[PDB]
Structures are given as structure tokens and as C-alpha cells.
Amino acid sequence: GMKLPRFGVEEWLNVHENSAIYDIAGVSISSLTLEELFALSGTNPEDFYKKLQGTKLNYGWIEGSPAFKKSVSQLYTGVKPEQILQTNGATGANLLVLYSLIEPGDHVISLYPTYQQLYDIPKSLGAEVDLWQIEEENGWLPDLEKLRQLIRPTTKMICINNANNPTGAVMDRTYLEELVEIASEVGAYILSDEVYRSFSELDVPSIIEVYDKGIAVNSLSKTYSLPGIRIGWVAANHQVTDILRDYRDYTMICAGVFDDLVAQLALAHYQEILERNRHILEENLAILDQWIEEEPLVSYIRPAVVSTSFVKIAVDMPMEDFCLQLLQEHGVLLVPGNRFERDGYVRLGFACEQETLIKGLEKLSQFLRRFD
């Protein structure tokens, strides 16, 4: 539509996901079953079902359970449970933040390309949105000097995605502190969608650990392998949290009763999930790295050990056509770079089943021999 464009990755997936033989387009980490979650957590399934079975499926915990709020707060330094609001995924959290806070005429600066919510939602609300461009020559980070040129006395909000979708690149503490010093000149909020926790050795604090006006969005979908419960949160200062609480009936009311119950269990054993997911990330990333070095037509900036990557394909044809042809001919699904307004690249999600990765890559290399 006019002030709200179709969601580009979504439209691509809607059309092509059912045609995929080897799906390396998703950017999550191999999802958990309840069975696997019980096993890694040491939970007795029968006790869980007994509790569930007798719970009224009313609106439940409007803002998330006390255990949810406490466990989430504990993932951060210096954040109280009262600063946590449960949402339907990081999706619902980004929407709740932007819809609640952004007014017509507000100036907003968004990392770009990045997750499409972060720039198109504010545009749709009448914001004036400037794009803060990532630079492949600088590790896919945008230029803080350019940010100083874009910011205005009245800038309301800067949106970032850390680590970023599609690149997997991360701003570390030193970078974030400089970003914060710039935002602090004008009292701008910084909304940081943090679904991609780096498993690298970099020091990567949450925005809210470096800035009082940092608004952290996160979820159990990408780092914790539970997209199917649709549980995320916003972490913000008391003032922001108090504003947001009065707008959740426009978008969600609340998240689900069972969904929150599973979230409580997952968060109570988050370190076990991280350990599972570290192995998948490191082993699959090593496979991707080896392949990238072996294949002369592809190269990339290695992601900060998160489940998204953005691979540069040295072939002179639009990537949408390249990916359509690869799909038709070999059944391999990628997301082409033009869907992020950076053609010449494809988004490759590698933290899927290792077998599917290997075959996908093998078949991609087969396709690439057609262009030498």
C-alpha cells in the first residue's frame, strides 16, 4: 500500500516456501519440540500437563507471568521485572513500541537495510524516516559520522537491529556507547531489536544496559528455538513501559496462556538451550565457512555467530531471477538480496538441519558451475 509497502521477505516466502526441496531461507535455529524441551530441562512431562490441563484459558497474565518477567529481567544487568512486557513475538514488541511512541511528523532514523518493521512502520504512522546505511566495506556497520549528519535537534528515535537481519553483523559495546552519546545529545530513544544474540566472543550489551532510553526488543524465536509459542518482550525504562501498557489492546491484548507457560520453562533453562544452539551454530557455520572459501563465485562478511548470513554472489544477473532459477532447477530456497534493497547478495539461513544445509550448498555449487 501507499504508506505501508508489502513486507518483502514475507511476499517472497508466501509465493515460494511450498516449492522448496532444500529450504535454507529461514534464519532461525532448528526448532524445539516440547519433548526436547522437557528433556533438556529435566522436566517431567506429566507434571507440566497436569498444571496446563487445569489452567483456565482466559486472558491469563496480561503482561506475562511473574516468572516470565523475573527470568527475562535476569538476562540483563540493571533491569527490574516491572520493566518487562510480554508480547506476541519480537514482531508484536516492535509494533507495540513504534505504534505507541511514534507520532506524525516525528523524525526517526533507521538502520538500513534491516528488519522491515523498523523503518516501514514509522513511515506508515506519518514519521519522517531517514536511512542509516550499512557499509559492507566497514563490516556491514553503518557510519557513526553519517549518523551525526542525519540526527536533528528533535529526532525522536533511532532504530537498530543488533545483530542485524540480514547480515548477522553486530555492534559491540564500544560502538554502542558512541551511538548512545549521539542519541543522548537530543534525548532520542534507541529501539534495538535484539532477537539475534551473538554467540561470538564480542562484548555485546543490550541497548538497555548502555542507555536509559534504550528500548530492547527480544524473543524466544530466534536464539531459543521456540518461534511457535509466539513469545517476545519489550524491556524499557519505567516511563516507556507505562506508556506501552495502555496500547496493547490495539495489537494483541496479551500472548497465550500455554505460550507463557512454555516461555517460563524455557527461560528457567535458557542456558541449556544456549548450549544446544551454540553447537548447531558453530558446526553449521564451520560448514558454511569451508564452502564459502571453496566456492570462487561467492564471498561474505562472516556473521557474528548468529543464524543469518548475507552472501555475495559474483554473477551478473538480478538475484531474484537467480534465486527463482535455483529454486525451479534444484529446489534450493534462498531470499534474494533485492528484497533487502541490496541486489548482488542472497540471505542464507544456515542453522537448519545440517543435512539440508549440506545438500543445499552442494546444489547451489552445481548451479554456480553454470556461470563460470
Choosing from 66, 78, 126, 187, the residue that interacts with a copy of itself (CB under 8 A) is 126
Pick the closer one to a copy of itself by CB: 126 or 187. 126
Determine the Cα–Cα distance for residues 148 and 154; give it in Å rounded to an integer. 13
Q: Does 3 bind a copy of itself (CB under 8 A)?
A: yes
Tell me how many residues contact a copy of itself (CB under 8 A): 71
Cα angle vertex 240, ends 215, 143, to 5°?
A: 30
Choosing from 20, 32, 234, 240, the residue that interacts with a copy of itself (CB under 8 A) is 32
Cα angle vertex 334, ends 278, 295, to 5°?
A: 80
Pick the closer one to a copy of itself by CB: 28 or 155. 28
Among 7-15, 153-161, 177-185, 285-293, the segment contacting a copy of itself (CB under 8 A) = 7-15
- Least separation, in Å, of the C-beta of 144 and a copy of itself? 29
Among 124-132, 267-275, 316-324, 342-350, the segment contacting a copy of itself (CB under 8 A) = 124-132
Determine the Cα–Cα distance for residues 91 and 117; give it in Å rounded to an integer. 8
Stretch (H or E) spanning 363 = helix 354-368
Q: Does 270 bind a copy of itself (CB under 8 A)?
A: no
Q: Does 57 bind a copy of itself (CB under 8 A)?
A: yes
Pick the closer one to a copy of itself by CB: 121 or 147. 121
Determine the Cα–Cα distance for residues 120 and 122; give it in Å rounded to an integer. 5
Q: Does 250 bind a copy of itself (CB under 8 A)?
A: yes
Q: Does 262 bind a copy of itself (CB under 8 A)?
A: yes
Could you tell me the sign of the dihedral formed by the alpha carbons of 206, 208, 209, 213, in that order?
positive
Q: How far is CA 84 from CA 66, 75, 217, 273, 303, in A?
A: 10, 11, 10, 21, 29
Pick the closer one to a copy of itself by CB: 226 or 301. 226
- Least separation, in Å, of the C-beta of 337 and a copy of itself? 18
Q: Does 7 bind a copy of itself (CB under 8 A)?
A: yes
CA-based nearest residue to 309, from 332, 330, 292: 292
Q: Which phi and psi (to 5°) does residue 5 adopt? A: -65, 150
Q: Does 23 bind a copy of itself (CB under 8 A)?
A: no
- Least separation, in Å, of the C-beta of 228 and a copy of itself? 3
Choosing from 133, 143, 175, 256, the residue that interacts with a copy of itself (CB under 8 A) is 256
Pick the closer one to a copy of itself by CB: 6 or 173. 6
Considering only residues 149 through 178, tell me which ones interact with a copy of itself, judged by CB under 8 A. Answer: none
* Residue that is written with C-alpha cell 559495546 in the block: 173
Pick the closer one to a copy of itself by CB: 91 or 291. 91
Among 181-189, 252-260, 284-292, 355-363, the segment contacting a copy of itself (CB under 8 A) = 252-260
Write out the DSSP string of 236-293.
--HHHHHHHTTTHHHHTS---HHHHHHHHHHHHTHHHHHHHHHHHHHHHHHHHHHHHH
Among 67-75, 91-99, 159-167, 299-307, the segment contacting a copy of itself (CB under 8 A) = 91-99
Determine the Cα–Cα distance for residues 274 and 223; give it in Å rounded to an integer. 8
Among 97-105, 276-284, 339-347, 361-369, the segment contacting a copy of itself (CB under 8 A) = 97-105
**Coil, strand or helix: which one is 39?**
helix
Choosing from 19, 44, 55, 325, the residue that interacts with a copy of itself (CB under 8 A) is 55
Among 100-108, 171-179, 300-308, 359-367, the segment contacting a copy of itself (CB under 8 A) = 100-108
Spatial strand order in the sheet of 128-135: 84-87, 232-235, 214-219, 189-193, 157-161, 107-112, 128-135, 141-142
**Coil, strand or helix: which one is 108?**
strand
Q: Does 369 bind a copy of itself (CB under 8 A)?
A: no
Stretch (H or E) spanning 190 = strand 189-193
In one letter, which amino acid is 106?
Answer: D
Considering only residues 199 through 238, tell me which ones interact with a copy of itself, judged by CB under 8 A. Answer: 225-230
Q: Does 42 bind a copy of itself (CB under 8 A)?
A: no
